Automatic annotation (TrEMBL), chain A:
<keyword id="KW-0813">Transport</keyword>
<feature type="transmembrane region" description="Helical">
    <location>
        <begin position="480"/>
        <end position="498"/>
    </location>
</feature>
<keyword id="KW-0406">Ion transport</keyword>
<feature type="domain" description="Vacuolar ATPase subunit I N-terminal proximal lobe">
    <location>
        <begin position="5"/>
        <end position="56"/>
    </location>
</feature>
<feature type="coiled-coil region">
    <location>
        <begin position="98"/>
        <end position="125"/>
    </location>
</feature>
<keyword id="KW-0175">Coiled coil</keyword>
<dbReference type="GO" id="GO:0046961">
    <property type="term" value="F:proton-transporting ATPase activity, rotational mechanism"/>
</dbReference>
<feature type="domain" description="V-type ATP synthase subunit I N-terminal">
    <location>
        <begin position="116"/>
        <end position="204"/>
    </location>
</feature>
<dbReference type="InterPro" id="IPR002490">
    <property type="entry name" value="V-ATPase_116kDa_su"/>
</dbReference>
TrEMBL record, chain B:
<feature type="coiled-coil region">
    <location>
        <begin position="3"/>
        <end position="40"/>
    </location>
</feature>
<protein>
    <submittedName>
        <fullName>V-type ATP synthase, subunit (VAPC-THERM)</fullName>
    </submittedName>
</protein>
Length: 632, 40, 62
């Protein structure tokens, strides 16, 4: 249909062109390009193919259009054959039928809109006018004015006409309908009087207005009455039309989409031998082999589980050759526990995160927009919900661990094992979070730091590896010098951390530690020699974020001591249900912010990731927001 | 890509079309001769 | 390869339609001449034949 062989099209990053080419070449594929720089050894662009293209576009578009007016819109689907001609033929009756009704629907609505609005002035004016609208032989001017204009028209009329006219008005809501009646001889003067007044002849578009009021009034009544009934009948037909034939459109539409791309791709190969990917035309025999050998990479168009799922997608860039350095695939176990352990809390909080999870991988039908989430129904599309089933679970797992770190947190929140106050407070367990002891807090602080110090190591090793294995002396020097930097930080810290633990064990080694730093920074020379401050800021940043991870955590915890524990009344056994009045509202606001907190991790990682520490992305660049990748 | 292989193979073909045309024009040169001879 | 095979195979099948065409464009020339020639030898039998019969008649009639 495009060649006697049918094209299969695949694309991915620049690195995959070569790997894609080797597996495909082996499969039994023919009319292969990319290949060399001036290839034209197969088939090329021609009028006819372009013509066909035009035709397919018409097919695509027509389906879309008809669906739009009709209501709903089609899914993508796999191609269903039906001749190009046949398809063209297919499209025709349905669009036309639908279209005619679409017109009818608008027309009916338009009639009603005018008819309702105009009905009241016209009957009212007609009643006033009656006896002159048997045949004007007296000439009449209708007009609506409310209260304000009413003296102005009369005064004008009186001067011009004298008093040989009849001026009448009655209210009806929508001002008062007013009439001036004059002889057919006085008409010129009567109108002139109106011109001054600023009020002017009430008009209805088309035939009706020119026709005196009585005839017009009748005409408005028939239309008003007619239109709603008629609309129902046609609309009903439209509804029916959608139900049956929407299906037809969808299958056709989809077929058209694959064809359009396929042809366009072909145009690209013909001429100027493509860019970076790899195509080819495949006999049916070759077609399974090509799906078969792929090494986890390409995107095509033809024609434990938590841990494995994102790991499988980072693998495609593990296989990509572009450096001798490593990719961010190890990232998943450094992130994953911690991400869960970001959740911190107790009875009023963490230990309630369970519920949230149950609505994700599940739902509860009491939730206005989490209706049937297993079949996806949302304030965003059903399809998105179905796709992010993968996610709904990864979030659910988050919920399972976050609840668990609710007891992890809650170890140091109670007992008579370690703190000399009650086993569980009898009102509600947890009433005062005990960590405000210098030491108790300190160990949790230093604990957080540690996962960060390791992350500093993770980057700089990889970083040094970029320059090692490419022989970028510049990348080597960067990674090495910053590890020199670490030595000085550690000296000062000890002199405050035990105060007297070291600080003269390593604080006199310090004179020599500064020497360990500067050896290779000076080898790069550097012009941005100052930047080493900021590099010290990175060591500290890992600490700092981790520190925040503690503090913000604690902050979360201190709200249960007024929001679930006790904050109102001297103290009773009614305090349980006294406190819930404010508590519940505040809870969700609190909930939201910790979602923000989990982005602190990603940013933390991103300090290293997007900034080349043996990694691709460097303030963007090819390779795509990795956050969004590992999420599944 | 190996440039030469496909960028030369595309030439071989042309010279087979070319060769057809040559072998053709002679047939015309044959009938021209014959057109004279039989009348002469 | 089989890829280069399809391009061969096409070019040759086209070649033979040119060559057979070439023959036909000749064939009509060849056969045109034949037809023309027939009309020349015959037409000259005619005129000369009259120049015979009529010659003898007037000779006898004389």
């Amino acid at each position: 249909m495009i060649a006697p062989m049918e094209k299969l099209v695949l694309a991915g990053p620049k690195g995959r062109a070569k790997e894609l080419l080797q597996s495909l070449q082996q499969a039994g594929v023919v009319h292969l390009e990319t290949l060399r720089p001036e290839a034209l050894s197969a088939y090329q662009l021609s009028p006819e193919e372009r013509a066909e293209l035009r035709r397919w576009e018409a097919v695509s578009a027509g389906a879309e259009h008809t669906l739009s007016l009709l209501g709903l819109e089609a899914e993508p689907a796999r191609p269903f054959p039906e001749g190009l001609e046949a398809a063209e033929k297919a499209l025709s009756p349905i669009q036309a039928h639908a279209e005619g009704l679409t017109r009818q629907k608008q027309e009916l609505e338009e009639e009603l809109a005018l008819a309702q609005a105009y009905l009241e002035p016209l009957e009212r004016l007609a009643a006033l006018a009656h006896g002159l609208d048997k045949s004007p032989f007296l000439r009449v001017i209708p007009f609506l004015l409310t209260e304000k204009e009413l003296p102005l028209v009369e005064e004008a009329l009186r001067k011009a006409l004298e008093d040989r006219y009849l001026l009448a008005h009655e209210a009806y809501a929508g001002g008062v309908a007013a009439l001036v009646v004059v002889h057919r001889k006085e008409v010129d003067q009567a109108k002139a009087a109106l011109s001054r007044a600023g009020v002017a002849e009430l008009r209805l578009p088309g035939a009706l207005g020119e026709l005196p009021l009585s005839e017009a009034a009748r005409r408005l009544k028939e239309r008003a009455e007619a239109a709603p009934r008629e609309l129902s009948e046609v609309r009903q037909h439209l509804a029916k039309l959608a139900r049956e034939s929407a299906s037809t459109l969808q299958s056709l539409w989809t077929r058209a989409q694959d064809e359009v791309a396929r042809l366009k791709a072909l145009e690209e190969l013909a001429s100027g031998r493509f860019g970076f990917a790899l195509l080819g035309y495949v006999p049916v025999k070759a077609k399974p082999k090509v799906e078969e050998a792929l090494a986890r990479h390409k995107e095509s168009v033809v024609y434990n589980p938590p841990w494995a799922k994102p790991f499988e997608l980072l693998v495609s860039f593990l296989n990509t050759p572009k450096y001798g350095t490593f990719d961010p695939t190890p990232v998943v176990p450094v992130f994953f526990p911690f991400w869960f352990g970001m959740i911190v809390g107790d009875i009023g909080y963490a230990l309630l995160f369970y519920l949230v999870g149950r609505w994700l991988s599940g739902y509860v039908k009491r939730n206005e927009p989490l209706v049937i989430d297993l079949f996806a129904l949302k304030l965003k599309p059903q399809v998105i919900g179905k796709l992010v089933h993968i996610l709904n679970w990864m979030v659910f797992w988050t919920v399972v661990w976050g609840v668990i770190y609710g007891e992890f947190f809650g170890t140091f929140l109670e007992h008579l094992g370690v703190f000399g106050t009650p086993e569980h407070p009898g009102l509600i367990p947890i009433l005062i979070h005990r960590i405000d002891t210098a030491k108790t807090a300190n160990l949790l602080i230093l604990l957080s730091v540690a996962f960060g110090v390791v992350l500093v190591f993770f980057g700089l090793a990889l970083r040094a590896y970029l320059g090692l294995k490419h022989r970028h002396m510049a990348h080597f020097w960067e990674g090495v010098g910053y590890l020199g930097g670490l030595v000085g930080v550690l000296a000062l810290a000890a002199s405050y951390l035990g105060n007297l633990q070291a600080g003269w064990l390593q604080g006199l080694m310090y004179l020599g530690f500064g020497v360990f730093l500067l050896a290779v920074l000076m080898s790069r020379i550097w012009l941005m020699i100052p930047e080493i401050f900021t590099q010290a800021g990175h060591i500290l940043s890992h600490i700092r974020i981790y520190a925040v991870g503690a503090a913000g955590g604690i902050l979360a915890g201190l709200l249960t001591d007024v929001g679930f524990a006790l904050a109102e009344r001297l103290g009773l056994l009614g305090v349980l249900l006294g406190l819930l009045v404010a508590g519940v509202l505040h809870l969700l606001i609190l909930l939201l912010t910790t979602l923000g907190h989990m982005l602190q991790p990603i940013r933390l990682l991103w300090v290293e990731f997007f900034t080349k520490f043996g990694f691709y992305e460097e303030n963007g660049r090819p390779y795509r927001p990795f956050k969004s990748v590992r999420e599944a | 890509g190996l440039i030469k292989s496909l960028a030369e193979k595309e030439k071989q073909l042309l010279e087979r079309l070319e060769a057809a045309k040559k072998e053709a024009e002679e047939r015309v040169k044959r009938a021209e001769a014959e057109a004279k001879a039989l009348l002469e | 390869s089989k890829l280069e095979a399809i391009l061969s195979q096409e070019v040759e099948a086209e070649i033979q339609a040119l060559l057979q065409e070439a023959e036909a464009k000749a064939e009509a020339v060849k056969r045109e001449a034949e037809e023309k020639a027939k009309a020349l030898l015959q037409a000259r039998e005619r005129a000369l034949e009259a120049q015979y019969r009529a010659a003898l008649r007037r000779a006898e009639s004389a």
